Amino acid sequence: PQVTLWQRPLVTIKIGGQLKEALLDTGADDTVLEEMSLPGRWKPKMIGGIGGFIKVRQYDQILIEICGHKAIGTVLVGPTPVNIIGRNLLTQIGATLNF
Amino acid sequence: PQVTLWQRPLVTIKIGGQLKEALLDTGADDTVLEEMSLPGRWKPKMIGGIGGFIKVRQYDQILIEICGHKAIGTVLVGPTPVNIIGRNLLTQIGATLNF
Numbered sequence: 287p288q289v290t291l292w293q294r295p296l297v298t299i300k301i302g303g304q305l306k307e308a309l310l311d312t313g314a315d316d317t318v319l320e321e322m323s324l325p326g327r328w329k330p331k332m333i334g335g336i337g338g339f340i341k342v343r344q345y346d347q348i349l350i351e352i353c354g355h356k357a358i359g360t361v362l363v364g365p366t367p368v369n370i371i372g373r374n375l376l377t378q379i380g381a382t383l384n385f
Numbered sequence: 386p387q388v389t390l391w392q393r394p395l396v397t398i399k400i401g402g403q404l405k406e407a408l409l410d411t412g413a414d415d416t417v418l419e420e421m422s423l424p425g426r427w428k429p430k431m432i433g434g435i436g437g438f439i440k441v442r443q444y445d446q447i448l449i450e451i452c453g454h455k456a457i458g459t460v461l462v463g464p465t466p467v468n469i470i471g472r473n474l475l476t477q478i479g480a481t482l483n484f
């Protein structure tokens with residue numbers, strides 16, 4: 287769909303059986319989700335944002351369905367205030383930015 | 386321009402006589418720029434991100450030129466590590482997200 291930016295560009299995702307809303311975020315290189323139940327192995331990573339750094343657990347090869355579209359990739363889970371879909375998955379879904 | 390997201394979507398901007406590069410960011414409601422010299426005065430605000438909060442100065446009715454396109458809006462100037470163009474100006478240059 288084409289999304290104007292008058293309102294935050296929020297999408298529904300299903301990950302790990304659960305349904306969330308997430309922000310489409312061209313400024314994030316990676317995806318980061320608030321804290322959740324994901325099975326399996328992960329690694330601690332820390333990421334920096336505005337405001338400072340958080341510690342995050344990195345899960346690889348996670349399937350996400352985002353709007354109708356299905357991607358697989360790394361998701362970082364951690365204390366974010368918002369769920370962010372960043373460019374590692376945006377390029378799989380084929381999102382583009384236009385002006 | 387149509388911009389795919391395999392690299393960070395950066396553009397050149399001109400603000401207050403100075404040239405800078407900034408990130409086009411759909412996750413960000415507002416524009417926040419690294420510390421620089423701007424005329425006029427300003428109001429102090431606090432914004433929160435990952436990591437937490439920062440203290441910034443709001444300037445309003447600032448002219449920015451972002452690729453060939455001029456826009457006026459509020460700009461937050463503060464200790465961000467990256468210059469960010471958020472939705473308040475992305476709206477004025479007519480940016481859309483498409484997938």
Ligand SMILES: O=C1N(Cc2ccc(CO)cc2)[C@H](Cc2ccccc2)[C@H](O)[C@@H](O)[C@@H](Cc2ccccc2)N1Cc1ccc(CO)cc1
Nearest residue numbers: 313314315316334335336367368412413414415433434435
């Ligand atoms: O911290 C933010 N990161 C940090 C970030 C870093 C890494 C990842 C995973 O790779 C995800 C997010 C981005 C901007 C940025 C990039 C790199 C370094 C520093 C900053 C993001 O792209 C922006 O959308 C919001 C995301 C956000 C939005 C709401 C609440 C929390 C987080 N922010 C914060 C932000 C908030 C308000 C404004 C002004 O309105 C601008 C930025």
